[PDB]
Each structure stands twice: as structure tokens, then as C-alpha cells.
Amino acid sequence: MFSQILIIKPGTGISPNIIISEDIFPVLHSLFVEHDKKFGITFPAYSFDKKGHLGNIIEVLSEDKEALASLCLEEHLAEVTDYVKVKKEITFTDDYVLFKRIREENQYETTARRMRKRGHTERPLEMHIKKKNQQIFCHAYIKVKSASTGQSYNIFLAPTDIKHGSFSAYGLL
RNA sequence: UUUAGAAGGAUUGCCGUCAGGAAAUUAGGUGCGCUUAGCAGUGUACCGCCGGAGGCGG
């Protein structure tokens, strides 16, 4: 489907990850919440070696050649331009590896509270947190702040093989 | 197709008593260490929700 490719300009001091997290996410999520129809996000350079990176490059994907123009890409990112360039041609294509959202247990105290009142009252838990968190953590992230809960959380990512489907507000499957 | 082919070494035991190492000394003059440099995988993994382990929202 149609797509608009996003560079971060390289060799500027700041890392890709920081620039991607702070700039691109907030404005894309605000635009995504606004224009309700679920768009999609793909990273053309995922390269999991022992841990997993995210690359210089991201792709916004959608299935309407005018919906991308309804997002007004190159005029929204008009402050931080020195670190981001937004190409302006919504070219269709049929090659991509879509991504999803992996989750990660939660700290022992926050599980406990639910773990007691919910019932199922009173070391087996700690093994579950340690194993489940240790397995996942070695993937990529995109630190996220909050508008409501006003909290800091990290949204991990991982590939999949669906090649079509229905997406979410942040951008994954 | 090998100087081929073969093989049970084994039982037992009290090393002991005594003793002065000791007197003398000069290690000494010299000395060029010295050019360069960006520390981090995002600096962390937060509240809840289903639900008898496995999931999903922000």
C-alpha cells in the first residue's frame, strides 16, 4: 500500500532513538487520535543481533492515497527539521514486515495488590516476574509518556507475519 | 600376517644417645619520557484491566 518514508538526518550528535521517541511519536499519535482511521508503522531496518535496534528509518503505511495527505506530514514537522526530513510522495509498495506490541508482567508490589484482593491470597511469583521480564526486555522500545495516567512506560516492539490486518492507536497490530 | 603365541612376587619388622660457627670491613660518580583522544543499547521497564496459566488498554 501507499507509504511516506521518514529519515532522521544522520551525524548530528543526538542518537536516532532519542530523536524518534521524542519528536515523531507524539505528533504521529496526536494526528492518529485525530484522524480516527488506524494507520500503520513499519521499521525497514530492524536488525535483532543479540538485542534489537530500530534503524535510521521508519515507514508510515495506509491504504488510501488521500488519507496520508489528510495527515499533512511535511508541514507538521516544521520545527525540528534540522534532525528530520519528510519525503513527499505517497508511493505504493507491497514489501514490509509489520510489528506488534509485546507486554511485560509488572513489578511485584503492583501484582500483589491485585493478587490479594482479587483473592488468590498468599517466591513462585518472583520467578514468574524475573523469567517473563528477562525474556522480553531484550527487544526494542519507544519510551512513552502519558496524557492521562501521566506516567512513564516503555512500549516494546517485535516482528510478525500477518501482511495485512487491523491496527491500533499507537500504530501496531 | 610384527624376536609370533603364554604368565599372581609375597608374608613380618623400635635407628638411636651427645654437642659454642666466629672475628674484620667506604658501592660509587652521570642522565629530557613524550605526540594524540568525544562513555552508556533509549537509562529504564509505570498505573490498571480481564480472568482460571495465557492476554490486553494508557
Strand partners, A153: A144
The SS3 of residue A118 is coil
**DSSP secondary structure letter of residue A148:** S
Which residues in range 110-139 of chain A are in contact with strand B, contact meaning CB within 7 A of any of its atoms? 110, 113-114, 118, 120, 124, 128, 132-133, 137-139
How many angstroms separate the first and last alpha carbons of chain A? 16
Nucleotide nearest to A50 (CA to C1'): B41
What is the widest separation between alpha-carbon atoms in chain A?
59
Best CA proximity match to A90, nearest among A63, A60, A65, A70:
A65
Straight-line distance from CA A119 to C1' B41, in Å? 40
Which residues in range 16-45 of chain A are in contact with strand B, contact meaning CB within 7 A of any of its atoms? 17-18, 21
Cell triple for residue A171? 500504530
Report chain B positions within 7 A of protein CB atoms: 38, 41-49, 51-54, 56-58
Please state, in angstroms and as integers, the Cα–Cα distance from residue A1 to each residue in A60, A73, A146, A158, A163, following that order: 10, 17, 31, 21, 11
Q: Is the CB of A163 under 7 A from strand B?
A: no
Which ranges of A7-107 would DSSP assign to H, the alpha helix? 16-19, 25-34, 73-76
Q: Is the dihedral of CA A29, A153, A78, A44 positive or negative?
A: negative
Per the rule left: phi > 0, alpha: psi between -120 and 50, beta: everything else, A170 is: alpha
Which ranges of chain A would DSSP assign to H, the alpha helix? 16-19, 25-34, 73-76, 108-117, 124-136
- Cβ atoms of residues A6 and A58 within 8 Å: yes
Distance CA A94, CA A30 (A): 27
b (16+ CB within 10 A) / e for A49-64: eeebebeeebebbbee
Q: Is the CB of A142 under 7 A from strand B?
A: yes
Residue A19 class from Cβ within 10 Å (0-12 exposed, 13-18 middle, 19+ buried)? Answer: middle
b (16+ CB within 10 A) / e for A119-146: eeeeeeeeeeeeeeeeeeeebbebeeee
Residue A39, CB half-sphere, CA atoms under 13 Å: how many?
Answer: 27
Residue A171 class from Cβ within 10 Å (0-12 exposed, 13-18 middle, 19+ buried)? Answer: buried
Distance CA A48, CA A153 (A): 22
- Cβ atoms of residues A1 and A62 within 8 Å: yes
Distance CA A21, CA A85 (A): 16
- Cβ atoms of residues A39 and A95 within 8 Å: no
Straight-line distance from CA A100 to C1' B6, in Å? 79
Distance CA A45, CA A43 (A): 6
Q: Is the CB of A103 under 7 A from strand B?
A: yes
Q: Is the CB of A92 under 7 A from strand B?
A: no
Q: Is the CB of A78 under 7 A from strand B?
A: no
State the structure-solving technique: cryo-EM
